[PDB]
Design a protein around this nucleic acid. Structure first.
Length: 187
RNA sequence: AUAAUUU
């Protein structure tokens, strides 16, 4: 029973840490704007507008409880517990040629998912393939899922090991896997 | 329609 509460809390921490994480934050206009208002602090009242978090829970107390137990320890909770922020002690990394070169080399391309698959479907399928930091479902201008995605692993090592595996299939359907830069090379 | 949404 309470194990499901732990499961819910782990999901809450992951979703919030994604929003304020190294991959997302630098390209999140709405969030970078909010962060400029009160020294990084963002009211839970605002955090609740984030769709994926909303679907997990809308309750402030549950969110605070979950974050206070987070292992990652990326987020800080205010004293009155009405707002949160990325720790000032965990600044965003400087984006150098080296950093970008490393991110590109940890990025993979995977084609072959059914057009109706959701982000949750894919996340679950990637659960046993290594540490993932970002999943980008490729869509058309009108936001229609093409069935192909880009995945960013925690390191070039886990990325390499994923691409090295030739017998991978989704719901018993073959998949085309390539390093992102290799996918572009062809295109 | 910054009515931005893995906001």
């Amino acid at each position: 029973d309470n194990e499901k509460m732990a499961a819910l809390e782990a999901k809450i921490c992951h979703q919030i840490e994604y929003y304020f994480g190294d991959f997302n934050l630098p390209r999140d206009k709405f969030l970078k704007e909010q962060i400029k208002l009160d020294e990084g602090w963002v009211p839970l009242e605002i955090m609740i507008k984030f769709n994926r978090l909303n679907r997990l829970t809308t309750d402030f107390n549950v969110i605070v409880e979950a974050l206070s137990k987070s292992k990652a320890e990326l987020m800080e909770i205010s004293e009155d517990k009405t707002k949160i922020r990325r720790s000032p002690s965990k600044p965003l990394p400087e984006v150098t040629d080296e950093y970008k070169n490393d991110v590109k080399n940890r990025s993979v391309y995977i084609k072959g998912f059914p057009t109706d698959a959701t982000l949750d479907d894919i996340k679950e399928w990637l659960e046993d393939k290594g540490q993932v930091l970002n999943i980008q479902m490729r869509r058309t201008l009108h936001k229609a899922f093409k069935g192909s995605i880009f995945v960013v692993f925690d390191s070039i090592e886990s990325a390499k090991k994923f691409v090295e595996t030739p017998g991978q299939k989704y719901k018993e359907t073959d998949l085309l896997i390539l390093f992102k830069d290799d996918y572009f090379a062809k295109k």
